[PDB]
Amino acid sequence: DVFEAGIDGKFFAYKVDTFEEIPFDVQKFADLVTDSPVISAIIDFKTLKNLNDNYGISRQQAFNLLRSDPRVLREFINQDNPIIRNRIEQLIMQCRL
């Protein structure tokens, strides 16, 4: 189970294997956040869902993306995945100042 939440108030809960949503337990999210190290969702849930639907990424690739692995992220960028490139460009542009 992956629980994701953002500063903009959007929260999701899905499964590592198949990125299908499940009910979001705020209490369980808080419990996990207090201790477990949090992962910066560089590829957010919407981006991961789109990527899985339209590209069927491998289990290892999904694992690495969820963990926010630079290797897989850069592999997709170089492979010219429009979805990943759009998400990364969104982040770079949001780094306004």
Partner 1 sequence: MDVLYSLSKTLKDARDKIVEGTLYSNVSDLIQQFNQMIITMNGNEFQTGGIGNLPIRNWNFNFGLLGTTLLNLDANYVETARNTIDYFVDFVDNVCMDEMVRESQRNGIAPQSDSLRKLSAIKFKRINFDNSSEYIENWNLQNRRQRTGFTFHKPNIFPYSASFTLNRSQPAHDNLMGTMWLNAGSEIQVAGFDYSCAINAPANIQQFEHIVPLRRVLTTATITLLPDAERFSFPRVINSADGATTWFFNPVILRPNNVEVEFLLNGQIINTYQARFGTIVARNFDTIRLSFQLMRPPNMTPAVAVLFPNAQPFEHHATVGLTLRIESAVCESVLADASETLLANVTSVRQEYAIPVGPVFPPGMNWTDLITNYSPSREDNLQRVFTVASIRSMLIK
Residues that bind a copy of itself (CB under 8 A): 35-36, 70-71, 74-75
Count Cβ atoms below 10 Å from residue 19 Cβ, excluding itself: 21
Whether the Cβ atoms of residue 29 and residue 3 lie closer than 8 Å to each other: yes
Nearest approach, Cβ of 76 to partner 1 (angstroms)?
12
Reported as type and span, the H/E element at residue 84 is: helix 82-94
Nearest approach, Cβ of 33 to partner 1 (angstroms)?
17
At 3, list the tokens. 């629980």
Task: List residues near partner 1 by CB under 8 A.
Answer: 12, 18, 20-21, 27, 45-47, 49-50, 52-58, 83, 86-87
Nearest approach, Cβ of 90 to partner 1 (angstroms)?
9
Q: Closer CB to a copy of itself, residue 44 or residue 75?
A: 75
Buried b (16+ CB within 10 A) or exposed e, 36-67: eeeeebebbbebbbbbbeeeebeeebbebbbe
74 binds, among a copy of itself, partner 1, none (CB under 5 to 8 A by kind): a copy of itself
